[PDB]
Design a protein around this ligand. Structure first.
Ligand SMILES: NC(=O)c1ccc[n+]([C@@H]2O[C@H](COP(=O)([O-])OP(=O)(O)OC[C@H]3O[C@@H](n4cnc5c(N)ncnc54)[C@H](O)[C@@H]3O)[C@@H](O)[C@H]2O)c1
Ligand SMILES: NC(=O)c1ccc[n+]([C@@H]2O[C@H](COP(=O)([O-])OP(=O)(O)OC[C@H]3O[C@@H](n4cnc5c(N)ncnc54)[C@H](O)[C@@H]3O)[C@@H](O)[C@H]2O)c1
Ligand SMILES: [Mg+2]
Ligand SMILES: [Mg+2]
Lengths: 342, 342
């Protein structure tokens, strides 16, 4: 049962997804789609794809694939997911999931009514270091977690790879903070209330590139999500997410260079949580690139057995509501009940 | 020529102040005062102070000192500052300044009508590393500051040397966070608005021992004041305050071991901001103990020069409001307007 997938949106990051599909056991890419025949041709030759489509409606009409991997930008997401549901094709969707929390819910509802899986490609929680933090806290090595911090502070030029980032009136939460919020959820549970502040420091972008978010977790823990693309440090940590967790029995400290300090009753342990460097990977992206293979293999496995995925459309609504809360909060000075939004 | 001071409250921390007055150029301690006959004996004998009093009223009646140094616990701060003003004797008063913001304002007003200097003994500000960070930022090394973190996370047994801390129904913001909020003002200026979460983790005490505070500075900067005494680290940082600052041209990062790191236009510097170990000083408190010499020497200088001190009673109202806002916000769950309190 070698699953045959189709990829819609042969863009900058989709090249990572295509490399990873070769490595994925039990699945591979049978067709591709793109409105930009330059990208369709370039990706098509690179990964040796016979079937190529100028529009996604033709692709879905011909079929011959078990699942669809949507790697377009947010504009196309809702329709391509709706197309996928009408044709009963299981769907993976990049982030941001949708333009609003409304769009995301209808996208979750359409796929449930159709009885098809819907994973959101949210690969930050699928990195080795992040999993190691979860693994540690899951064991009980530091007792009940009560306080956390999640940090992604960088001066790396993401705007060359992704020019659209500088164009929007929204930027860092929508794009990057969405991940860091997903990790806060993934480590400390769902969020009851959220308060946020944003700022634009960089004068060559239309959007906020610094954000600081304070999270009240349902489980009792407080956490800090702080992100910036205007932080100029001695060593560029990009694209690492630094994490501190305190609990009743101990502390976790995931720091720059993937050094992982855990301290408990028995004592301290220092562990190297560095990612693997895959054959097609490229520094410093190798961290994220590995997590593409992790989440795509996870999709394939959960699909082949029947189960729900980790970042299912259903799950991802609870991450996406923090993003939407954050912007709301940023324009009011005021806390947002997350429970009321869902 | 040397100024004559009188010390009211010969407890635990007053012993550091006494040593420092010895070292301070231009001042000494002519008289000590304490309500406990055994403390009055111990400190009096250790520092060879002839004049000893069981009550401040008798002390103030006899007079013969140019300033008073109040190092009692918070309950008797108002009465002693009010006596000081009634006898026109310049006053140094410990933290916490008063029991409420109401009391503090009234104490500041009393000292202005009597027309005497009033300085809150708020010494964290005067630590070598904390001054070093101030100097970097003033230099303009990193441009305009836009974001800060001020962190004091320890598992140290402070309860032995000060039993009242466990007893208080309010703990960490009143005791330690007052320092970290003062530092946030010192580095990034006054606060427009404030929002705070707290919890008690230690089963043994009655007060909150973890606080996470998010500050909106008038100059546009945002910061996180996070403090804890229920934090179990593999190397105990007590009593260091770890500071992170981001500005438009660079960053400051003061990490454990008084390691100051500045990144700017002209590369990146690393310096050692650790304090002197004074003859009478003793690790790991040499941090705080040096600042006592600094602030008291600063007071003498300023009382001689007729200049208003750095932690003047009136300035310290803008710190104290943040403590009173943080408790209020922790209960509310709602952002507090600072300017309205003042
Ligand atoms: N960590 C991650 O998982 C990660 C990393 C980078 C980017 N992303 C996300 O991936 C998405 C794409 O990022 P990118 O930088 O590759 O953008 P991109 O512009 O390079 O890629 C989008 C491609 O999709 C095509 N496209 C758009 N609408 C289409 C439609 N209706 N049918 C067919 N093709 C269509 C465009 O021609 C373009 O080539 C973004 O939403 C971004 O948030 C995720
Ligand atoms: N870094 C610092 O600046 C620092 C460090 C520790 C404590 N403190 C502050 O110092 C203050 C005292 O701390 P401590 O640990 O020395 O407490 P303590 O109980 O050891 O000392 C206070 C002393 O004052 C005496 N006293 C109280 N009321 C009096 C009155 N009306 N007249 C005469 N004597 C009186 C008591 O008998 C006691 O001996 C606290 O308010 C605390 O916030 C500051
Ligand atoms: Mg394959
Ligand atoms: Mg002297």
């Amino acid at each position: 049962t070698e699953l045959k997938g189709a990829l819609i949106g042969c863009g900058f990051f989709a090249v990572n997804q295509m490399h990873a599909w070769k490595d994925v056991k039990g699945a591979g890419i049978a067709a591709i789609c793109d409105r930009d025949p330059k990208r369709l041709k370039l990706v098509g030759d690179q990964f040796g794809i016979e079937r190529r489509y100028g529009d996604a409606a033709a692709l879905f009409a011909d079929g011959g694939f078990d699942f669809v991997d949507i790697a377009t930008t947010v504009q196309s997401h809702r329709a391509l997911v709706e197309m996928a549901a009408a044709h009963k094709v299981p769907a993976i969707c990049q982030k941001p999931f949708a333009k609003s929390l409304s769009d995301a819910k209808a996208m979750v509802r359409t796929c449930e009514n159709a009885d098809i899986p819907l994973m959101v490609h949210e690969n930050f929680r699928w990195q080795t270091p992040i999993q190691a933090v979860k693994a540690v806290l899951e064991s009980g090595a530091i007792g009940e977690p009560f306080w956390g911090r999640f940090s992604f502070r960088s001066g790396f030029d993401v705007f060359s790879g992704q020019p659209y980032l500088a164009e929007g009136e929204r930027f860092i939460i929508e794009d990057l903070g969405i991940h860091t919020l997903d990790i806060a959820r993934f480590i400390l549970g769902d969020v009851a209330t959220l308060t946020a502040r944003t700022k634009r420091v960089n004068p060559k972008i239309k959007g906020e590139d610094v954000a600081t978010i304070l999270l009240d977790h349902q489980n009792g823990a407080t956490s800090i999500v702080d992100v910036s693309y205007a932080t100029k440090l001695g060593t560029e940590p990009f694209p690492e997410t630094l994490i501190d967790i305190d609990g009743t029995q101990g502390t976790i400290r995931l720091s720059q260079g993937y050094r992982l300090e855990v301290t408990g009753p028995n004592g301290m342990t220092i562990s190297d949580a560095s990612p693997q460097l895959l054959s097609w990977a490229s520094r410093p992206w190798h961290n994220i690139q590995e997590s593409v293979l992790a989440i795509q293999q996870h999709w394939t496995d959960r699909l082949s057995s029947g189960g729900e995925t980790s970042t299912s459309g259903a799950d991802n609504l609870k991450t996406f509501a923090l993003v939407e809360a954050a912007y709301e909060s940023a324009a009011n000075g005021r806390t947002v009940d997350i429970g009321a939004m869902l």
